[PDB]
Design a protein around this ligand. Structure first.
Ligand SMILES: CC(C)(C)c1nc(-c2cnc3ccccc3c2)c(-c2ccncc2)[nH]1
Ligand SMILES: CC(C)(C)c1nc(-c2cnc3ccccc3c2)c(-c2ccncc2)[nH]1
Ligand SMILES: CC(C)(C)c1nc(-c2cnc3ccccc3c2)c(-c2ccncc2)[nH]1
Ligand SMILES: C[S@](=O)(CC[C@H](N)C(=O)O)=NP(=O)(O)O
Ligand SMILES: C[S@](=O)(CC[C@H](N)C(=O)O)=NP(=O)(O)O
Ligand SMILES: C[S@](=O)(CC[C@H](N)C(=O)O)=NP(=O)(O)O
Ligand SMILES: C[S@](=O)(CC[C@H](N)C(=O)O)=NP(=O)(O)O
Ligand SMILES: [Cl-]
Ligand SMILES: [Cl-]
Ligand SMILES: [Cl-]
Ligand SMILES: [Cl-]
Ligand SMILES: [Mg+2]
Ligand SMILES: [Mg+2]
Ligand SMILES: [Mg+2]
Ligand SMILES: [Mg+2]
Ligand SMILES: [Mg+2]
Ligand SMILES: [Mg+2]
Ligand SMILES: [Mg+2]
Ligand SMILES: [Mg+2]
Ligand SMILES: [Mg+2]
Ligand SMILES: [Mg+2]
Lengths: 475, 475, 475, 243
């Protein structure tokens, strides 16, 4: 799509405002608004300025000015704003040299796609994602010298079966969802059918190609919506826009959505499973009828890369402290580094897809939505490609419930990392696979390590946990 | 003291009940009560039974029965019970062989004192402890699927300067304590003078030899009371009784005390500083007028042991998850493994005591009150003795504010461990210094490692921290 | 008085505890308690240790240990503690050299008295102080990102004339005090007669020699109690003890006292007027029947010193930000640097005392109770002495209501400083008169300047004032 | 003039749009403690006969002599100029480090910690300008804009050279280096005193007259400075209740 295509769309749609969007380092979309009258060729030729020092992982204050240049492929009408608005994603550029920014997440995805082509291994990496989320009714939390709390609430949460009335004072009418029981009974047990339909419609109307929507395992409103896979960059853009649509559909309908990995203790976390495949010249590369689970050598080695690089890879795929609360046994999330067909307890599942070579793929179950899809997707590809290049053989598949393994057998398999600080330490120690072709640069990696330590790891570490009071008040 | 001394005391004091006490593995004293009529020679000769399977770190259910034999040295009159009561500590013994129990904390202390004698290095280890605590007004906390909280409160807490009224509805009269400002302005700013006097009196009346009491640094009622040092076992007994007296004096006066390492975020933790010295034949061994800070070779090598074994030693001296919230810079607790005279930012301080050889000692500032003094003191001695035996040289003292060291300089010094899991892992890997002379046995160490992992580390790890909601709800 | 006098007092009075007191740099008394059994010759010979790094204006953390040595002159029985307690003030000493500490306020007073003797000008400086205070019922305050407040309350406050009920729910019975009308109608208009009697009695029973008590001008419980003058050091010790007695008598009777300079806006502040005189060989030096207001040359030059050094002197006599809210016209506090007999609007008043040479003195009306009487008294003496030494002539007395001066005449007289930052700047620039004889040392002055800037001036400056919202919300 | 008229109308529209939608707007410099204040950055340029005067490809940050001297005027007259650009007591609660407002009198390209930033605008001579970051919305844009112009013009007329640009995070300067650069004023009373003492650059051509300046000084002293000074601050109670 061209600049002239976007102008035509704006004109045809009687757009009043253009929302200029880009991604910060951690993974939150940023925006400012310009009037339709200011949306001209100049925007494409000169770009637009912003304060790079107010954006996380970007610039220092004395080098603040940064530049944005539009990506015409990303233009969509906003489904929410009363004043007709066109949303466009931008690339961050140096204001002097006009070079792409080394710490623009969208640039990383750009570089990743080019690197893939340059290896000759394939020309396209397809990503199918499943970003699960919770539809809550409310949240509050604080952190003070003498105390701290959080509370999430949802009409359908099992913890409310004994409530005398609903939050608004109306009667308790039951049909709440049992812990681990949300997948997926019919209404009225499923209390979110109409809302998810509204999410599905809003996605459709923003040009998503939909596949399914359903309630997920977790009590208190867990959900999943699936849209069609795409190439790496487009898929990352899709993900960001999806979260925006889901969050705001909820918001406008009196609810509140979180994509955090584990908001509920003792119920399912929310993953971002990534179904991945490599294609060259319009033909699939993952399939070999003679391989375990129908997998080719290229596929097997890609898995080998993922599982081998996991200890550092998770710094981008599972980038938060909360991520590691999800990686615990019993909730269909991974606890060790094995692949296995049909296996929802494994780190890499191979879905059952029959003999169609186009459908063959791996499902990397480890990732969650708590970070940056541009970085996450790119990091996975780099790990996968290193696997192919080095012909890294994954350890034999284990076709078992990996949560139920006796302690002695469970030790003879590498575990997923326990906590964020471990993966950050490991990323710091070993990250050469990410710097290949300059896809990730040392300044990006250092900024990432630094940001996570100072803004996440340490702030959590220094604050007493409520359960420590359960454990230790009476020592 | 003899059995007959105890009977005389009971008779003279018109005792109605005898409280039979012993220590569980983690460090909480256990008790049951027998009538005076049942307190006879048979108690000394046969001992008394209890259910070892209900006590933490003791027996399994099918091997439950255990035996207790009294320690006449520990007999004190209870200051609290309306029915006149004599308290006595007991040793845990195997019910078949009558051998001392390998997981009786008091037995470990016993074995430690004997081992010291057997080395010929010294015949007595003196421990002077400072168990800091908070005198709170209230506490509540919970942990649920959809939320969790804690709150401590205290009339003198700075967080309450804005309260319209006190908890009982009476007017806010100010004079609250500023964070880091409780040490130690006169009343009415100090709101606990009369209460601490009651604590001091109760201690005096239980045969403690008192040295001082004061408000400590922390807002919301932090306090310290000091009693005379003693030999290892007696000192550990003194510590347990002291906690009992402090907690129950508070309780009887409408307050609630915690010895947890860090109940307040952004204010001082509570330590258990251990002043330590070795003596032989009634003469002190720590002093040498020509050594740095007046320390002899024996003293220096003891410190060498402490600082060298720190990464595993802290598993007994700093044995909780909350312990590691205290080991942060800015609050007069250690953050790295150095010794230094006069230095309250150091891991081992040498207090200024002049040329009197009897007064020379090291202050090990790392430990807290959150575990077991029997095991903690013993573990310190074993580390200290290994240092003497191997002539371990501590790295040079650093006479500086250790929280304010330039980056290069700081990184050259070994840091204190970050978290409990690290010290437990390290203890598991390397613990030979503790097993010397059979003072700690492998079964004790394995039970400890096992207990901490299953009951403390893991339960905290799996529960989302409220601050993760602050950080991540909107990802 | 001797060590043996104190031991006899403790024994005779059946003392249970000794409260060890000393003064921090800003002017708050500090304390810890030792049992009677620990109060022996050793306390006089060796002294006692404390943490100098937790005391304001004292030591850094790496040089923390400091030493205290008792001052037998200061031993008094505590009127408040249920356990009989003897209070004693200590001097702070270096733990190595045993030299007096350069930043012990009590040492500064000591040094001041010695310097006076060494000049040959006089051998005794007598200080008579009037420390006014407010007896409030309640106070609360806070400071947050989005707001801040304070409120003081008192049953007799004029702002309460329209209250439907008292704070406890009982009826409003009127007889509240008008603004500027508390001095000094009989009860029931004076609602604090019995409470002030208790204050008087507690002072008498602590060996104070009393002169008068009354309600002061301010509404809502302002008060004044006067005790006999004494030499500098004794007077400063008297002041500190007086504050303790006033505050705790109030506290024990359900009230709350503040000595802050200006807690009420539009009503009188609280001063600490200092009546001063110099004596040599038991004869008074202030009187000369032929001088204006019966003042000798020595007296007149002393005044000249005070008024000349005022722009720096106030850094010790008026040491808080709140101090400068009192130095405003219309409330019997000074607004310019003049002396005048009989004149309550002046900076130095000469009280009408007739022809008795022993009664002649100057009243320095500028100082308040918001700081450190040891430092304040000493600083006034140093200014006064520099005046005598340099024969500094004060500008001619102005026998007029100074708040009512014509603009042209007003502008010609030097004003009192506007704010704390001004006097701190001036102290920093010019302070030689304080360093004479080493009474104040550069390290004291630098610490003072630094403390006030970082802990008082700056924190107030950065916080929006509520009146700014009245002024500017709608700009 | 048009710009000042635009500013006044803009405030009216912002305030009343909010009002009509159940909200309430403030343009005060610093209503939140520990979070960003609200500035009124002024991008300035001079033109003659339809051509821009600010640009010179060979100057630091593409700035001409005329531009550089204009900056020199602003930074030189700052101690009095702020009486019109930062005219309230609340103004000075914003001029504190760490919130993208100025704390000293330096210019620097790309620098959001500086008093005058030169925004990155490339080689287009029409786009070159200086951003004076000091001013806020708490006063009078007619007077503020005019005062900045008078300072800027005095700079050109007297060829006042600004001190060398400092291309550093100015909140993070080493103490020794910081102390060598002139600081922004601490409080309103300081700039009013300074305005009273030295204001000739404003009276040039009779743009500001003595009666305006005297009324301004008098108004600020009697209605703003003094009323704040006499009222105890709540934080004084936190500090001093227990003295
Ligand atoms: C949306 C999701 C995650 C369920 C998904 N569906 C698919 C999917 C399912 N069935 C297919 C059948 C035929 C062709 C492509 C298909 C893709 C893929 C995918 C992703 C990457 N590479 C290949 C496939 N992912
Ligand atoms: C109570 C505490 C911790 C303050 C303490 N005082 C002391 C202390 C202080 N001063 C002394 C003076 C003389 C003799 C012994 C002393 C003991 C010691 C101690 C501990 C171990 N070994 C020696 C001393 N510990
Ligand atoms: C208590 C106060 C402040 C009212 C006071 N009374 C006195 C006072 C009042 N009358 C006196 C009559 C005779 C002798 C001494 C006197 C002291 C003095 C004072 C202070 C310093 N030097 C001399 C006097 N101060
Ligand atoms: C039902 S589930 O297996 C549950 C996944 C879980 N929420 C997680 O990945 O953490 N997801 P799917 O079957 O949609 O891949
Ligand atoms: C004043 S402090 O230094 C504070 C110690 C702190 N609570 C800690 O050890 O965490 N203790 P001490 O009584 O040893 O002087
Ligand atoms: C009545 S007053 O003049 C009032 C003094 C005022 N409170 C002050 O701020 O100094 N004091 P005094 O007459 O007791 O010296
Ligand atoms: C992001 S900021 O730098 C913030 C300015 C701040 N509010 C100030 O007080 O000037 N402003 P801009 O980049 O819009 O000029
Ligand atoms: Cl972590
Ligand atoms: Cl842990
Ligand atoms: Cl000030
Ligand atoms: Cl001001
Ligand atoms: Mg799915
Ligand atoms: Mg799913
Ligand atoms: Mg899936
Ligand atoms: Mg201590
Ligand atoms: Mg202590
Ligand atoms: Mg100590
Ligand atoms: Mg008086
Ligand atoms: Mg008075
Ligand atoms: Mg007076
Ligand atoms: Mg700007």
């Amino acid at each position: 799509k061209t600049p002239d295509d976007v102008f035509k769309l704006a004109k045809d749609e009687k757009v009043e405002y253009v929302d200029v969007r880009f991604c910060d380092l951690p993974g939150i979309m940023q925006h400012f608004t310009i009037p339709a009258s200011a949306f001209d060729k100049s925007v494409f030729d000169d770009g637009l300025a912003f304060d790079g020092s107010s954006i996380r992982g970007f610039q220092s204050i004395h080098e603040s000015d940064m530049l944005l240049l539009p990506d015409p492929e990303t233009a969509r009408i906003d489904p929410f704003r009363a004043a007709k608005t066109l949303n466009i994603n931008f690339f961050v550029h140096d204001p002097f040299t006009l070079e792409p920014y080394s710490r623009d997440p969208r640039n990383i995805a750009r570089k990743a796609e080019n690197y893939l082509i340059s290896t000759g291994i394939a020309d396209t990496a397809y990503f199918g994602a499943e970003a699960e989320f919770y539809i809550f009714d409310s949240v509050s939390f604080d952190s003070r010298a003498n105390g701290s709390f959080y509370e999430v609430d949802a009409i359908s949460g099992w913890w409310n079966t004994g409530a005398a009335t609903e939050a608004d004072g109306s009667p308790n009418r039951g049909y709440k969802v049992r812990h681990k029981g949300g997948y997926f009974p019919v209404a009225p047990n499923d209390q979110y059918v109409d809302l998810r339909d509204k999410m599905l419609t809003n996605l459709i109307n923003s040009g998503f190609i939909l596949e399914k929507g359903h309630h997920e395992v977790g009590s208190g409103g867990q959900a999943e919506i699936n849209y069609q896979f795409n190439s790496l960059l487009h898929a990352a853009d899709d993900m960001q826009l999806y979260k925006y649509i889901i969050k705001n559909t909820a918001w406008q309908n009196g609810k509140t959505v979180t994509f955090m990995p584990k908001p509920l203790f003792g119920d399912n976390g929310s993953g971002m499973h990534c179904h991945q495949s490599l294609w060259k010249d319009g033909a699939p590369l993952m399939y070999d009828e003679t391989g375990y689970a129908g997998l080719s050598d290229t596929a097997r080695h890609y898995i080998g890369g993922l599982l081998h690089h996991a200890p550092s890879l998770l710094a981008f795929t599972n980038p938060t402290v909360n991520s590691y609360k999800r990686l615990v046994p019993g909730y269909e999330a991974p606890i060790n580094l094995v692949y296995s067909q049909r296996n929802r307890s494994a780190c890499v599942r191979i879905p059952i897809t029959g003999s169609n070579p186009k459908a063959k793929r791996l499902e990397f179950r480890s990732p969650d939505s708590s970070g940056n899809p541009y970085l996450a997707f790119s990091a996975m590809l780099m790990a996968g490609l290193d696997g192919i290049k080095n012909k890294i053989e994954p350890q034999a598949p284990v076709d078992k419930d990996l949560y139920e393994l006796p302690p002695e057998e469970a030790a003879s398999i590498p575990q997923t990392p326990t906590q964020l600080s471990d993966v950050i330490d490991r990323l710091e120690a070993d990250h050469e696979y990410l710097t290949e072709g300059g896809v990730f640069t040392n300044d990006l990696i250092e900024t990432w390590i630094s940001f996570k330590r100072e803004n996440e790891i340490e702030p959590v570490n220094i604050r007493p946990h409520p359960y420590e009071f359960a454990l230790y008040y009476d020592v």
